[PDB]
Design a protein around this nucleic acid. Structure first.
Ligand SMILES: [Mg+2]
Ligand SMILES: [Mg+2]
Ligand SMILES: [Mg+2]
Ligand SMILES: [Mg+2]
Ligand SMILES: [Mg+2]
Ligand SMILES: [Mg+2]
Ligand SMILES: [Mg+2]
Ligand SMILES: [Mg+2]
Ligand SMILES: [Mg+2]
Ligand SMILES: [Mg+2]
Ligand SMILES: [Mg+2]
Ligand SMILES: [Mg+2]
Ligand SMILES: [Mg+2]
Ligand SMILES: [Mg+2]
Ligand SMILES: [Mg+2]
Ligand SMILES: [Mg+2]
Ligand SMILES: [Mg+2]
Ligand SMILES: [Mg+2]
Ligand SMILES: [Mg+2]
Ligand SMILES: [Mg+2]
Ligand SMILES: [Mg+2]
Ligand SMILES: [Mg+2]
Ligand SMILES: [Zn+2]
Lengths: 152, 305, 115, 217, 108
RNA sequence: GCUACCUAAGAACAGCUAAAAGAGCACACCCGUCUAUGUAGCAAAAUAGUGGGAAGAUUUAUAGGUAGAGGCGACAAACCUA
RNA sequence: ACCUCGAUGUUGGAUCAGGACAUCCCGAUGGUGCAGCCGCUAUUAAAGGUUCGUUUGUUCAACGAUUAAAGUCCUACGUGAUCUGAGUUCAGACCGGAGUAAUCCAGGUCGGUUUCUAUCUACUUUAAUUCCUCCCUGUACGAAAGGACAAGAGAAAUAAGGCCUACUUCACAAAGCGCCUUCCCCCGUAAAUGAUAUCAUCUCAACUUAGUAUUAUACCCACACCCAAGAACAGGGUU
C-alpha cells in the first residue's frame, strides 16, 4: 500500500536516492540540458525548481548558500546558480524546467526524458507544437468564437 | 483509426476558448435546474407509512469531532452533496422489481472523458455528465421528475441513514492483514513462515473449499455502514454530518439513503418526503440545523449542573 | 493498560502493600473478558506471595482525552467484599472513578486527592 | 503575529472546504471562550467542567509538553507531578466543557516537544498548583527558556539521544558517554535537512487563514 | 514441486498465443512534419532530437575548449554565434561560443 | 601436494591488564558454539551475525617420512586426494 | 496382513481449520426425590461460542485464576512440497544392569543436516452472539438459611465490516493500542373444537392457536499524464 507516497524508491536507499538526484541536478545546472531515465528526471524536476527558488533568495541568505553547497557537488556552479540562473528567472515565478520524453534507451530500452532549464543557450528542443490556427477545425472554432463575441 | 482526445487538434487560441465555453455551458445548465417546482413538477404526494424516498450521492470531505450536551465526543464525517440531480425514473412494471427506481447522479465531470451514449443521455436530460450514478428503490409516491436537484437538507438532524461506498483499496494483501490471521512466531526456529497461511484445508477432501480465506485483493469493494445518525446539516454548503466513519477514502462519492434498520422503519413522517425543495421557500432554512443534543459552536461552555 | 505479569505500584496505606518483599506485586488476573485492565477494573495480585484483589486507579497507557495518564501503574488493594485494605491513598486518583460511586464508595472515601 | 498551530493544516489531499468549515467552527468557539497564545513549555491552568469532580469543576495546572492535532480536534497535553506522582492530561482546546485556559507563565522551551520530561528528573516537571500567573509585557517577544534538564538513568521511554528526535533541552553530556553519543550519531541522516521536496511551505495557507480570522472578527 | 506430466503443444500454443501474450499494435505512431520520419505522438522525434543532440555536442565541445579546464563554469550568460554573425547589444557581456558553420535553419 | 602423526630447518603472534604464567581482555591468525539464510547453494559444507582460543599441548609456509593383511590416531572405529 | 518398502515422512505444538451430534454454554420443552437458588434427567436445536497460566516434550493429568461454558469425536490419531523437532531404539558419550567380549537394554541423561523454483486439480472479497450492572427485590418462594423469574433501563466483551477527527506507532499516508455500525425465524411440546369409539381424546382424523421460510430488505446496475486504483492488466480523474 503506497497511498499518498510521493517519492520514488531509487538507488540503494534514501541517501542513495538523494545522491543520485544530486548528481543529476548538478549535471542539469552545469549543462542546462540533461537526458536521463524518465522517472529520475521526474523526481529531480522538483529539486531543480527548488534550487532555482533558493538562488532567487540570494547569495547573502546563509540558508540558500548552504542548500546550494549541499546540492551542487561542483562548487563552481554555486556562483552560476546565484548569478546566471536566478537572475534569468527573476521575472518568472515557476516552470523553470522543461521535461520531454525521448525515444527509449538503446541499451536497456529504458524510458528516458530530457530536462532543460528554459532560456538556455543550447539549441532548442523539437518541442511539440499544437495544430495551426488555420486548420479546418481551428477555423471552425474561430468562427464559433467570433459568433459568440458578436452576440455579446 | 488512431485514438483522439479533445485537445489533440485544438490550437493554442482555441483550447482556452473551448474550456471557457464548455465550463460556462455546464454552469448555465446547472443553474437552469435551480427552480424545479416552477417547471412542471411531478405530483407531490403526502408521506404515508411504507413509503421509501430517494437518497443522495455525497462526497466524503473528512472527519471532525462533535460534542453533545452530555459532554461526550463523537467523530462525525462530512458528506458534501456536489451537483446531485435525479436523472432517470423507471416504474414498478418497467424495472420488473418490487419497487420503482430513481437514478441519481453526482459530482459533475468533464464531458470530454465520457462515452458517446452517456453524453447523449446527459444532453437530452439537460445536465452535465455526473461522476457517479446510483439507483435508489422507492415507492411511486416518491417519484421525482428527472433533472431535479437534491440538497443536503433532504435529510434532517436526528435522522438515521445508511452510507454505501467503495472501501479504500489495499491491493493484493497477505492473509494476515486481509483476514487477521495470527500468523507464525517470529523466532523459535520458524523457517520462512511468519505471515503465511497455515493449513488451507484437510488431507481427506484433497481440495480447497470454495470461499477459503486466502491472500488476495482487499478493499475497493462496495460496503455499507448502517444506522449512522445525522448530527447536523449545513445548508449553505450542502453538507451532512454523519455519525461515525463511512467506507471509502476522502473525496470519495458515497451513496446516502434513509436507514433500513427495523428500529428506524417509519421515522420519515417529518422528513421532506419526496425531497427538500428550496424553491418552495416556505421558510428559508437556517445556515446550520443541529440535533437537539449537539453542543452548537457559539454556545456557552457546558456545565454539568 | 494492566495485563497479566504487570508489575504494579500499590498506592495504599496498607501494610501488606507497603511492606518490603523480594518480588514486586504482579497482576495475576484482570477481572474483565479481555485481559486488558483500565481505570476502575479489578485485578488479582501476587503480592508478598499472597493472592489479593486490587483496584486499578491509574495507568501509563493513554486513555480518552481529558483523563489523567499517570507515570506509574497505580493500584489500590481491596477485599473481596470491596472494602479497601488500607486507610489512606495519597496520590491523585482520577475523578472518573467517582462515576462508580457505590461500587467503590469506600475506596473513593479513602482517596485523598483527585485529578 | 501568532497563528495557533491547529489552524495550519497538515498537507494532504483533503479539500480546503473541510478546513474552511472546521475553521469557522473553531472561530465560533474561540469567540465563546478565549483560547490564549501558548507554546510547548509554557505553564497552563485548565479549568474544565467534569460531571464527577467535586464542585463539578476541576482545575489542572501543568507544563505544556506537546501540542498536537489540527482543526477542531486539536489537543495539548499538560504534565505535572502531584504528591510525587507524574500525571499528564491531554486537553482538547474546543471541547465545550473547558471553562477556561489560563497561561500562568508564557514561555517557549528549546524544543517543540517536551515528552522527554518523563525521563527527566521530577523537579523539571514539578510546578506549584497555586502559583500566581506571571505578567508579560504587552508588546514583547515570548521568552525562550534555555533550561537543559538533567535526565535519570539511561533506560528511557524513547531514545532521546537519537538525532531524529532532534532534542536540544537535554544535558546529554552529563548522561551519555561520548561512545554512546557517537553510536547514536549513526542515525544522523544529514540529507534529510537538505532534501527540498519535503519542506512544507505554509505562507499562502497562513495568509488565507489570517484573512479568514480577520473576516470573522 | 516438479511437473506431473508434460504439457502438450496444443496447451502450450494456447498459452503462448493467447492475445495477452501477443504484441499490441501501437496506433500512436505519426509522421514528423519537420523531417518526415516516424515518431510516437507523446515522444520526441528521434531524428530531430539526434540533430539537436549533435549540435549540442558540438557547442558543448566548443564550450569546453573555451573553458580550458574543470570547475571553470562562467558566471555570465552564454550565446552561440555562427559564421557571418556578430554579437548583438543583448549578446554584449555574454560568453560567445563560436561555431564554424552556418546557423541551422531550425536553430534561431 | 588433502588429512593423521612425525623429521629437518623457518616464519607469525597489534594493543591493554598483569608479570618469567599451557595467565585475563582483545586484533591479526586458528577454530567452528548458537541462530538465520542457503539446500542443483557463492559453496559436492558457504555466507551474515554470534562465539572459543589467540606466548602456546599455538598457528603456519617449505621439503622429507610412515601405504592398505597396512599406516597414523590426546579411540571419534577419527584421518589416509570430496 | 488386503494397497503402499524403484519411500503413503508417523508423537506433541504453531497456523488454518471442514464436518458429526452421541450438546459443555447460549435457545425452546417434559419429568423430578422441581418450595426458591442451585441442580439431575430426557426431547429438540450444530447459527454462534467453547480462556489464560506453573511444572512436564506431553497429548492428557494436577494445580492457580477465570468463564455462560472452558464439550466428545472424525478429518492419513486433519494439516512437516505451510512451520517447529522438545520427546521419540542412527552415527558420539556417561550411569545402573546383561555378557568373557563385541555389543546390548521398548531404563535414564547430554548432543545430534526438516530439501523442493508449483506442471495439473482445487481455491484466492459468499440481518452476530454473549456476559454483566441497576430495577423488578430482599419481592415471588421459604421456618430459617437463603433467594428467583419475566418486563424495563444501561453498560460492556468478543466476532464481522469499515475509518483516521483525536491518542498512539506515526506523518501528503499506512496502522491499533484508537474510533464507528452491526437488523429475522426454526418446533421439542403446551393447549381449543372433535370423530373413529355420539363421554373423553392436541389430530401419522378432518381441524383451530402459540407457528415462522417463500426469509425480507440492503448492495451493484451507463495518445499521454495523475490517482486515495493497482503486481501486470483492469478501474477513477484530466474542465
Ligand atoms: Mg531499485
Ligand atoms: Mg506475531
Ligand atoms: Mg533450513
Ligand atoms: Mg525468518
Ligand atoms: Mg509462597
Ligand atoms: Mg515504552
Ligand atoms: Mg600479544
Ligand atoms: Mg593465554
Ligand atoms: Mg569409543
Ligand atoms: Mg562406536
Ligand atoms: Mg499384504
Ligand atoms: Mg492370506
Ligand atoms: Mg514411485
Ligand atoms: Mg440431539
Ligand atoms: Mg487410530
Ligand atoms: Mg529431538
Ligand atoms: Mg556401563
Ligand atoms: Mg535428547
Ligand atoms: Mg550444542
Ligand atoms: Mg520445510
Ligand atoms: Mg511456494
Ligand atoms: Mg365429543
Ligand atoms: Zn523529426
Amino acid at each position: 500500500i503506497s497511498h499518498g507516497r510521493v517519492f520514488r524508491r531509487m538507488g540503494l536507499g534514501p541517501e542513495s536516492r538523494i545522491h543520485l538526484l544530486r548528481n543529476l541536478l548538478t549535471g542539469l545546472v552545469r549543462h542546462e540540458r540533461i537526458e536521463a531515465p524518465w522517472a529520475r528526471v521526474d523526481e529531480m524536476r522538483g529539486y531543480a525548481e527548488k534550487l532555482i527558488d533558493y538562488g532567487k533568495l540570494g547569495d547573502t541568505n546563509e540558508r540558500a548558500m548552504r542548500m546550494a553547497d549541499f546540492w551542487l557537488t561542483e562548487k563552481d556552479l554555486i556562483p552560476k546558480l546565484f548569478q546566471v540562473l536566478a537572475p534569468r528567472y527573476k521575472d518568472q515565478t515557476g516552470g523553470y524546467t522543461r521535461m520531454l520524453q525521448i525515444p527509449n534507451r538503446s541499451l536497456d530500452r529504458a524510458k528516458m526524458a530530457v530536462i532543460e532549464y528554459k532560456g538556455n543557450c543550447l539549441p532548442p528542443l523539437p518541442l511539440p507544437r499544437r495544430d495551426s490556427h488555420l486548420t479546418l477545425l481551428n477555423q471552425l472554432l474561430q468562427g464559433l468564437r467570433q459568433d459568440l463575441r458578436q452576440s455579446q | 483509426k488512431s485514438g483522439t482526445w479533445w485537445d489533440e487538434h485544438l490550437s493554442e487560441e482555441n483550447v482556452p476558448f473551448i474550456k471557457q465555453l464548455v465550463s460556462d455551458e455546464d454552469k448555465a445548465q446547472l443553474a437552469s435546474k435551480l427552480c424545479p417546482l416552477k417547471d412542471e413538477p411531478w405530483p407531490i404526494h403526502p408521506w404515508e407509512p411504507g413509503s421509501f424516498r430517494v437518497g443522495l450521492i455525497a462526497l466524503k470531505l473528512g472527519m471532525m469531532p462533535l460534542w453533545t450536551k452530555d459532554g461526550q465526543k463523537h467523530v462525525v464525517t462530512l458528506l458534501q452533496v456536489q451537483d446531485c440531480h435525479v436523472l432517470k425514473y423507471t416504474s414498478k412494471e418497467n424495472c420488473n422489481g418490487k419497487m420503482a427506481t430513481l437514478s441519481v447522479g453526482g459530482k459533475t465531470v468533464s464531458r470530454f472523458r465520457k462515452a458517446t451514449s452517456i453524453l447523449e443521455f446527459y444532453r437530452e436530460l439537460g445536465l452535465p455528465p455526473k461522476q457517479t450514478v446510483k439507483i435508489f428503490n422507492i415507492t411511486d409516491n416518491a417519484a421525482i421528475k428527472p433533472g431535479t436537484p437534491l440538497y443536503a437538507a433532504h435529510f434532517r438532524p436526528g435522522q438515521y441513514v445508511d452510507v454505501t461506498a467503495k472501501t479504500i483499496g489495499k491491493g493484493f494483501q497477505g492473509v494476515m492483514k486481509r483476514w487477521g490471521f495470527k500468523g507464525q512466531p517470529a523466532t523459535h526456529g520458524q523457517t520462512k513462515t511468519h505471515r503465511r497461511p497455515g493449513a488451507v484445508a484437510t488431507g481427506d477432501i484433497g481440495r480447497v473449499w470454495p470461499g477459503t480465506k486466502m491472500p488476495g485483493k482487499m478493499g475497493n469493494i462496495y460496503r455499507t455502514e448502517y444506522g449512522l445518525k445525522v448530527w447536523r446539516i449545513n445548508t449553505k454548503h450542502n453538507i451532512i454530518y454523519v455519525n461515525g466513519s463511512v467506507p471509502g477514502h476522502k473525496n470519495c462519492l458515497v451513496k446516502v439513503k434513509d436507514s433500513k434498520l427495523p428500529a428506524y422503519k417509519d421515522l420519515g413522517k417529518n422528513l421532506p418526503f419526496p425531497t427538500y425543495f428550496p424553491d418552495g421557500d416556505e421558510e428559508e432554512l437556517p445556515e446550520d440545523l443541529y440535533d437537539e443534543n449537539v453542543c452548537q459552536p457559539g454556545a456557552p461552555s457546558i456545565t454539568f449542573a | 493498560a494492566i495485563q497479566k505479569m504487570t508489575r504494579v505500584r500499590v498506592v495504599d496505606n496498607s501494610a501488606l502493600g507497603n511492606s518490603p518483599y523480594h518480588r514486586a506485586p504482579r497482576c495475576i488476573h484482570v477481572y474483565k473478558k479481555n485481559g486488558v485492565g483500565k481505570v476502575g477494573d479489578q485485578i488479582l495480585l501476587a503480592i508478598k506471595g499472597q493472592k489479593k484483589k486490587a483496584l486499578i486507579v491509574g495507568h501509563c497507557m493513554p486513555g480518552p482525552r481529558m483523563t489523567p495518564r499517570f507515570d506509574s501503574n497505580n493500584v489500590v488493594l481491596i477485599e473481596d467484599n470491596g472494602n479497601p485494605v488500607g486507610t489512606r491513598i495519597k496520590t491523585p486518583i482520577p475523578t472518573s472513578l467517582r462515576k462508580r460511586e457505590g461500587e467503590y464508595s469506600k475506596v473513593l472515601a479513602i482517596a485523598q486527592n483527585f485529578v | 503575529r501568532f497563528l495557533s498551530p491547529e489552524f495550519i493544516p497538515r498537507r494532504g489531499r483533503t479539500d480546503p472546504l473541510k478546513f474552511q468549515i472546521e475553521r469557522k467552527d473553531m472561530l465560533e468557539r474561540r469567540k465563546v471562550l478565549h483560547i490564549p497564545e501558548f507554546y510547548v513549555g509554557s505553564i497552563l491552568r485548565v479549568t474544565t467542567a467534569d460531571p464527577y469532580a467535586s464542585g463539578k469543576i476541576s482545575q489542572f495546572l501543568g507544563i505544556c509538553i506537546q501540542r498536537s492535532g489540527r482543526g477542531l480536534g486539536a489537543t495539548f497535553i499538560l504534565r505535572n507531578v502531584i504528591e510525587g506522582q507524574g500525571v499528564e492530561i491531554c486537553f482538547e482546546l474546543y471541547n465545550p466543557r473547558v471553562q477556561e485556559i489560563q497561561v500562568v507563565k508564557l514561555e517557549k522551551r528549546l524544543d517543540d516537544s517536551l515528552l522527554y520530561l518523563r525521563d527527566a528528573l521530577p523537579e523539571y516537571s514539578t510546578f506549584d498548583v497555586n502559583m500566581k500567573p506571571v505578567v508579560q509585557e504587552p508588546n514583547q517577544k515570548v521568552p525562550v527558556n534555555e533550561l537543559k534538564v538533567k535526565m535519570k538513568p539511561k533506560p528511557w521511554s524513547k531514545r532521546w539521544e537519537r538525532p531524529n528526535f532532534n532534542i536540544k533541552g537535554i544535558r546529554f553530556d552529563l548522561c551519555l558517554t561520548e561512545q554512546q553519543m557517537k553510536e547514536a550519531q549513526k542515525w544522523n541522516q544529514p540529507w534529510l535537512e537538505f532534501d527540498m521536496m519535503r519542506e512544507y511551505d505554509t505562507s499562502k495557507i497562513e495568509a488565507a487563514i489570517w484573512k479568514e480570522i480577520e473576516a470573522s472578527k | 514441486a516438479a511437473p506431473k506430466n508434460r504439457r502438450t503443444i496444443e496447451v502450450n500454443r494456447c498459452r503462448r498465443r493467447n492475445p495477452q501474450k501477443l504484441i499490441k499494435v501501437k496506433n500512436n505512431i505519426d509522421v514528423c512534419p519537420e523531417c518526415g520520419h516516424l515518431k510516437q505522438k507523446h515522444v520526441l522525434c528521434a531524428y530531430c532530437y539526434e540533430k539537436v543532440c549533435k549540435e549540442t555536442a558540438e557547442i558543448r565541445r566548443q564550450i569546453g575548449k573555451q573553458e580550458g579546464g574543470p570547475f571553470k563554469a562562467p558566471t555570465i550568460e552564454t550565446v552561440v554565434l555562427y559564421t557571418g554573425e556578430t554579437p548583438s547589444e543583448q549578446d554584449q557581456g555574454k560568453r560567445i561560443i563560436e561555431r564554424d558553420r552556418k546557423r541551422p535553419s531550425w536553430f534561431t
